[PDB]
């Protein structure tokens, strides 16, 4: 939880940013602007803000999200229109009800208000599932008949529980992986 030290165009230098990591998204300012740390020097982490940096003042809190620039992969992105970052332009227009893009808009990349039909894959409870394996399928469109749900890569273990067939949203749990005794909850995305 550092503080803004310097602002000059997109490049923002934030002090007290100790323990940060390179190319880690950090919410700069009070509007929670997305920015990736591109340079570190001591406790100051140079950040490039992904939105309009005008109005940022020294002392504004900078929140470390702890993850790199991550794209939300899953059902629901097969038709939508995205900005540079995975910002849904249609969802932004619908929620904001305006022709502008509000600063620090936090609309989820994949909308969670749509119920997706899910058919579990060949994997069952107790089987060993590795990264990238298929444990389901989602009927997205007529063209994309089966949006096969992939277990995230570099995530592995044994299926503690798998959901039955039914209309599930992205926030809802789909499958559970135990690994080394630390059960992990995996959703549609």
């Amino acid at each position: 939880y550092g503080a803004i030290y310097s602002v000059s165009g997109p490049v923002v230098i934030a002090e007290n940013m100790i323990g940060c990591a390179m190319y880690e998204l950090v919410k700069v300012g009070h509007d929670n602007l997305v920015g990736e740390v591109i340079r570190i020097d001591g406790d100051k982490a140079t950040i490039q803000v992904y939105e309009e940096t005008a109005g940022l003042t020294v002392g504004d809190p900078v929140l470390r999200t702890g993850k790199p620039l991550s794209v939300e992969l899953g059902p629901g992105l097969m038709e939508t229109i995205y900005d540079g970052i995975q910002r849904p332009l249609k969802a932004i227009k619908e929620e904001s009800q305006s022709i502008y893009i509000p600063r620090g808009i936090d609309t989820p990349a994949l909308d969670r208000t749509i119920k997706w039909q899910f058919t579990p894959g060949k994997f069952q409870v107790g089987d060993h599932i590795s990264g990238g394996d298929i444990y389901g399928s989602v009927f997205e469109n007529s063209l994309i008949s089966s949006h096969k749900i992939l277990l995230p890569p570099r995530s592995r273990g044994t299926i503690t529980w798998i959901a039955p067939a039914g209309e599930y949203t992205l926030d809802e749990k789909i499958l559970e992986v135990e690994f080394d005794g630390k059960k992990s909850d995996f959703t549609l995305y």
Binding site: S6, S8, A54, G55, T57, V58, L89, K93, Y100
Partner: protein
Amino acid sequence: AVEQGFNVKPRLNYNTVSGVNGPLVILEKVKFPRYNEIVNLTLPDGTVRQGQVLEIRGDRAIVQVFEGTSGIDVKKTTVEFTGESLRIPVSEDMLGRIFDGSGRPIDNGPKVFAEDYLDINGSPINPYARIYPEEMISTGVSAIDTMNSIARGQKIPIFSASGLPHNEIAAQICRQAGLVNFSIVFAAMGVNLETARFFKQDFEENGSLERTSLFLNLANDPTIERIITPRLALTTAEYLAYQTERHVLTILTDMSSYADALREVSAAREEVPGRRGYPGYMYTDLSTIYERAGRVEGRNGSITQIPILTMPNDDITHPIPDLTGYITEGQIFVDRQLHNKGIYPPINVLPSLSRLMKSAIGEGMTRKDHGDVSNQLYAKYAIGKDAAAMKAVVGEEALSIEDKLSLEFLEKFEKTFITQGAYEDRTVFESLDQAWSLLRIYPKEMLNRISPKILDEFY
């Protein structure tokens, strides 16, 4: 109802000034500096000048002074932090008034009785909320309308050089810009008083001061207000076109002068230059300016931006024309060779381009043959230029029959089709008929780029 306007926020008058360097003023101790903040530098002489905070350190604030730093003391100068970005007062009555480079009245009239305070930088329009223009503007110039069409909502600049009649061409386009009335927002960035007087006189004679707003930043005006004038004019245009639902045609002139101002500010900041000293972020700044043109889904109203530009040495490869071609869609190339030959307008249709012509031209919008005729004209003009080069380098008899016919076409094209007197106002249909008359020089066989059905139906 904007009831939040009734609020007083006292401002911090900093007498802590240092590092006054060129266009830049540096404040040693600032309590929570705000980036892109407007300050009011009160000189020891008593005159105030607005300034923009370019960068903030922990306690510093590198301020750029729009009116210049000539006379700024380090001891008696007080800098007052307003606390917000620059907000021009906009109104519907703001049409018909002449403004300074910093949005101050020049016509000896009152200050704008503000209807709202709009930020200069505006807001980023949702690309999903934009409309593809697809509405041709009958600019009345043959070399433009027929071969590089302008759609209502298209940012098409006029690339020109020093001494060419770019001002005359743009004034003509503004005077005669009906669709196949327009409000106008004119921004003068460093143009000489002769050019500003020409533009104002032409607007008044045509009857445009009823529905125009001039932001005149002359050459004698301070050289950093050229950074702010296009933004003020463009947010005025955004207001007039989106909230009052008008159709605005912005004529930002001497964007080369704007880029020179940018380079001057960039050079003073001692930052990584880029190409020819122009700031590396010149693409981003030019995109921020140019990309404020077009139509929006909810609101019927557009900014038909036509940013006049001046090539330093008639070179496209220069950073300003190159980036302007990258961002702004299309280009109207004013040719020194054509002007020397005496053609008006001296528009060279080979470099001139319009990305939205293929969609705003033809198929019942104007006429069935517009696109094919413009392709045929471009192809035969390129053939004529190549044949002229070949006939200069080698013997004339070595040129083929097609090459000789194309030389004749090029002569009859520059001298009759492109050549258009001021106030002529050729309709797009009349220009197409004249272009066909030029294309009837060739036998039907060699009009290869014309679709055979149209060739049979129009030859």
